[PDB]
Amino acid sequence: SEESQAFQRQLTALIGYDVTDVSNVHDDELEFTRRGLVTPRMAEVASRDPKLYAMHPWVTSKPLPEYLWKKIANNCIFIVIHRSTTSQTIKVSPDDTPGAILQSFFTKMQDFVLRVCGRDEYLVGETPIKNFQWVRHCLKNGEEIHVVLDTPPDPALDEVRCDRKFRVKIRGIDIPVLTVFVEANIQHGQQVLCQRRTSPKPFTEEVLWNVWLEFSIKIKDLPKGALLNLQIYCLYYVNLLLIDHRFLLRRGEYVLHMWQISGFNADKLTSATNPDKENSMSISILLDNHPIAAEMPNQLRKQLEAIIATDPLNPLTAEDKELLWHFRYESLKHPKAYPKLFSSVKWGQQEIVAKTYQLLARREVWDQSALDVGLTMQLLDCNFSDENVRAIAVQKLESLEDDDVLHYLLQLVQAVKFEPYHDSALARFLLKRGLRNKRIGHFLFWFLRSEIAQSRHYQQRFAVILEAYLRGCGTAMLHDFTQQVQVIEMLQKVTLDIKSLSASSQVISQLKQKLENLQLPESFRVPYDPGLKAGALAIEKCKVMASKKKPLWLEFKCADPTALSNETIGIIFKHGDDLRQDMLILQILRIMESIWETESLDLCLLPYGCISTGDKIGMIEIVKDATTIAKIQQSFKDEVLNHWLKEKSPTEEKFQAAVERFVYSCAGYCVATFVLGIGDRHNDNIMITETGNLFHIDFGHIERVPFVLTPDFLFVMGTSGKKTSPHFQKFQDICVKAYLALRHHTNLLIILFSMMLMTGMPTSKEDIEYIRDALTVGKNEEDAKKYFLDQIEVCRDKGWTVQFNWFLHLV
């Protein structure tokens, strides 16, 4: 169809990659997955309620935290309602359903719905008012809930239209420009089954061996998902699945173009070949050589328990693995032992694998066990290639409500890189949950699109998954995405053009002019906050920041007239940094906020919105009324920070609340940063709001100091490096309370941290340990409770020693 060709082009401009192209495939894995990602799509699309899908209500089935209970005194909630400059307040009970509120309101005077004023956010569905996120947001922030009664959005325009051994031939290598040898492996889950090599020849434009590298593994022994790893060093690598998606073995000859090093990493596992054929190193290989689906003594059981108890970081001895394996059925009764057990499997042996799959038959204990996202994630990392082991983990995620899928959505999207094949249980899980919820689908869009734009190694796999989502999300979503992408390209253009014109009066004139040139969509959704829409630019408020990379400071008008405030939406555009690192960290900070919601804690973290759009290019949310701690100091005497708060405080009451939130916010970042090992930062990278909320920024690429707690912060808490103030005791306990709450989620944090380094960093093995030592693994609470207080003292014993040094390095 002529219309289908123009439609596919819409998806191509949206996705930023052409899926129909078959220039860089040696097989049909991609296309087969497209055909295979039609059934799952239609299955979720044909099974979704248009009404609830069109308004995409954001809710949680979790209990309301202890601290958020104090906010409600009379067991009633105030819901200000709007129709046209008219206000009708309604005192309401925490359990009052949105429907009841509609009739309970009309009585004081049922076709319409309560929409949040100035937002594409609705309060609809059989849910208590207390369970809506926008409601919990207002309580936490003291704001009141303003709502407008409007027609429920039309779901109409959401609609979609042998026993022989193995061998391989190393013919040679070829690079057009610029002692090197070949290294061939057979890997399953980053675990080497066998390794062969060649003879070192001098580095030149042409070096060939044509050697026959023989393997010890046998044809029926080869596990599904097994990769053929080919490497070269004196610095190039490529892979290829020994088994395709149809259970067929690799028959034929292959010319493969290789990736190069820039000096473990998610990229090293990719089954995709290098797109650039003009400059890349190539490999010559040929392959010519199907499948189907008494108890322990308590002394050994005690040893097995000790092994199960240890962390995910603790390596497994050959002694342990044999113990875990010989006692499979005792190990099966402990879900926490599944990662270590499946690591004890000889995947290079068909007879054992069969025992493995047979073992997975009766998963009575696994399927009944409470979901452990830390335990589930472990089965999804680089150390597991078995399609069925991963399937039981993805099976467990399905119980997750949309609320929790949002918290872990970024890590899940990244975990796709660890999948041996393009079509996986995980990729189908992401697709289902994306098509089932508009908010999940919105972020799934930008997460996929961030990788597709700056990742040569995986852009193909993600493009196919993004295409499968674009069809099925709806005609309405497609319009928004088109607008959003349209604006970001115009802004990124301006951002890049502005950056080059500077290493002034000249640039400031160039900015306003080029901004007046765009004058382009009338409105678009904010990528990091889909509820908000943006209008025309506040060109007068727009400016290039006095920062080293010349970042664009932009402000927009809100396109919603139903908004009480007149505030502009601020966004920063930056080409200097790699905002992928920032995304992961910020998302981990949100996960930390959730964990502290478990023990009923608020630390007032400010995980501002951040989205990577291209290569070292993206956007950051602007937190209103925030300034840098450094800027407060210059234009290092201690009392400065306190003068600022009282200055920005209209009343003495405002000041006290600003001091309170500072004690919490400071405590939150002190604990969070030290764990992630990013505690040592300069003043410029730590900001504060006029309302007392402290927060950090710029998380890309990171003597000594545990974390930042300078004398000015101490002074705002009223302590001169020796005494203990009333607020300081509050802070010093809050740190311990919050630090103990994270040790309880050690495995979850480690696995997240481990994945963040592999899929989001450029070795990899030793770097992970800091979070293990920081979390004080294998130590009682009190001894650990002191370890953190000792870390606080190292900040007191220090002062500006490193902070002054930081001032020295930049200059």
The mark string for 595-614 relative to ligand 6K5 (x by CB under 6 A, - otherwise) is -------------x------
> Minimum distance from CB of 621 to ligand 6K5 (Å)?
6
Report the residue number, 597 or 621, with the smaller CB distance to ligand 6K5: 621
Residues in the interface with ligand 6K5 (CB under 6 A) total 21
Report the residue number, 620 or 795, with the smaller CB distance to ligand 6K5: 620
Reduced 3-state DSSP string for 457-518: CCHHHHHHHHHHHHHHHCHHHHHHHHHHHHHHHHHHHHHHHHHHCCCCHHHHHHHHHHHHHH
Report the residue number, 258 or 532, with the smaller CB distance to ligand 6K5: 532
194 binds ligand 6K5 (CB under 6 A): no
Dihedral (CA of 530, 536, 540, 543) sign = positive
- Beta-bridged to residue 114, according to DSSP, are 123, 149
Whole-angstrom distance, CA of residue 682 vs CA of residue 803: 6
Report the residue number, 626 or 784, with the smaller CB distance to ligand 6K5: 626
DSSP 3-state of 194: strand
Known binder of ligand: residue 611?
yes
Tokens 């949040």 sit at which residue? 116
**Any idea what DSSP says for residue 63?**
P
491 binds ligand 6K5 (CB under 6 A): no
Query: In this chain, which of 243, 698, 771, 803 binds ligand 6K5, going by CB under 6 A?
Result: 698
Q: Could you give the C-alpha distances from 250 to 28, 270, 286, 287, in angstroms and in order?
A: 13, 17, 9, 7
> Minimum distance from CB of 179 to ligand 6K5 (Å)?
41
527 binds ligand 6K5 (CB under 6 A): no
Report the residue number, 624 or 796, with the smaller CB distance to ligand 6K5: 624
Known binder of ligand: residue 700?
yes
Whole-angstrom distance, CA of residue 574 vs CA of residue 553: 9
13 binds ligand 6K5 (CB under 6 A): no
Contact 93, 78 (CB under 8 A): no
- Beta-bridged to residue 712, according to DSSP, are none
> Minimum distance from CB of 586 to ligand 6K5 (Å)?
9
Residue partners of 734: CB distance under 8 A and separation at least 6? 601, 603, 663, 664, 667
**Any idea what DSSP says for residue 568?**
P
**Count of Cβ atoms closer than 10 Å to residue 357 Cβ:** 13
Dihedral (CA of 491, 493, 499, 501) sign = negative
Report the residue number, 386 or 712, with the smaller CB distance to ligand 6K5: 712
Contact 308, 337 (CB under 8 A): yes
Interacting stretch for ligand 6K5, rule CB under 6 A, among 199-207, 307-315, 331-339, 545-553?
545-553
Query: In this chain, which of 29, 386, 419, 577 binds ligand 6K5, going by CB under 6 A?
Result: 577
> Minimum distance from CB of 703 to ligand 6K5 (Å)?
25
Q: Could you give the C-alpha distances from 715 to 216, 242, 356, 792, in angstroms and in order?
A: 68, 64, 61, 15
591 binds ligand 6K5 (CB under 6 A): no
Interacting stretch for ligand 6K5, rule CB under 6 A, among 43-51, 573-581, 652-660, 795-803?
573-581
Known binder of ligand: residue 615?
no
Report the residue number, 488 or 572, with the smaller CB distance to ligand 6K5: 572
Residue 609, phi then psi, degrees to nearest 5 = -70, 135
Interacting stretch for ligand 6K5, rule CB under 6 A, among 442-450, 503-511, 543-551, 584-592?
543-551
> Minimum distance from CB of 443 to ligand 6K5 (Å)?
19
Known binder of ligand: residue 574?
yes
Whole-angstrom distance, CA of residue 625 vs CA of residue 277: 50
User: Around 429, how many Cα atoms within 13 Å sit in the side-chain half-sphere?
Assistant: 25
Known binder of ligand: residue 669?
no
Contact 79, 89 (CB under 8 A): yes
Report the residue number, 335 or 679, with the smaller CB distance to ligand 6K5: 679
> Minimum distance from CB of 193 to ligand 6K5 (Å)?
41
Interacting stretch for ligand 6K5, rule CB under 6 A, among 97-105, 442-450, 541-549, 736-744?
541-549
Reading across the β-sheet that carries 686-689, which strands appear in turn?
Answer: 626-628, 686-689, 694-696
Known binder of ligand: residue 618?
no
Known binder of ligand: residue 760?
no
582 binds ligand 6K5 (CB under 6 A): yes
Query: In this chain, which of 63, 291, 700, 721 binds ligand 6K5, going by CB under 6 A?
Result: 700
- Name the closest residue to ligand 6K5 (Cβ): 623
Residue 474, phi then psi, degrees to nearest 5 = 125, 165
Q: Could you give the C-alpha distances from 37 to 469, 470, 473, in angstroms and in order?
A: 9, 12, 14
Whole-angstrom distance, CA of residue 461 vs CA of residue 113: 40
545 binds ligand 6K5 (CB under 6 A): yes
Determine the Cα angle at 261 with ends 183 and 765, to 5°: 80
Residue 282: name the closest of 167, 420, 171 by CA: 171
Report the residue number, 600 or 685, with the smaller CB distance to ligand 6K5: 685
Interacting stretch for ligand 6K5, rule CB under 6 A, among 103-111, 152-160, 176-184, 576-584?
576-584
Tokens 């001098």 sit at which residue? 202
**Any idea what DSSP says for residue 157?**
G
> Minimum distance from CB of 575 to ligand 6K5 (Å)?
9
Report the residue number, 256 or 572, with the smaller CB distance to ligand 6K5: 572
Known binder of ligand: residue 106?
no
Residue 565: name the closest of 532, 526, 608, 537 by CA: 532
Interacting stretch for ligand 6K5, rule CB under 6 A, among 25-33, 350-358, 482-490, 696-704?
696-704
Whole-angstrom distance, CA of residue 755 vs CA of residue 286: 35
Quote the tokens at residue 782. 């009190």
Quote the tokens at residue 205. 């434009």
Where in 615-654 is the site for ligand 6K5 (CB under 6 A)?
A: 620-623, 626, 628, 631
Q: Please enumerate, by residue number, every residue annotated as part of a binding site for ATP.
A: 570-579, 605-613, 695-702
Which residues would be at the binding site for ligand 6K5 (CB under 6 A)?
Answer: 545, 547, 549, 551, 572, 574, 577, 579, 582, 608, 620-623, 626, 628, 631, 687, 697-698, 700
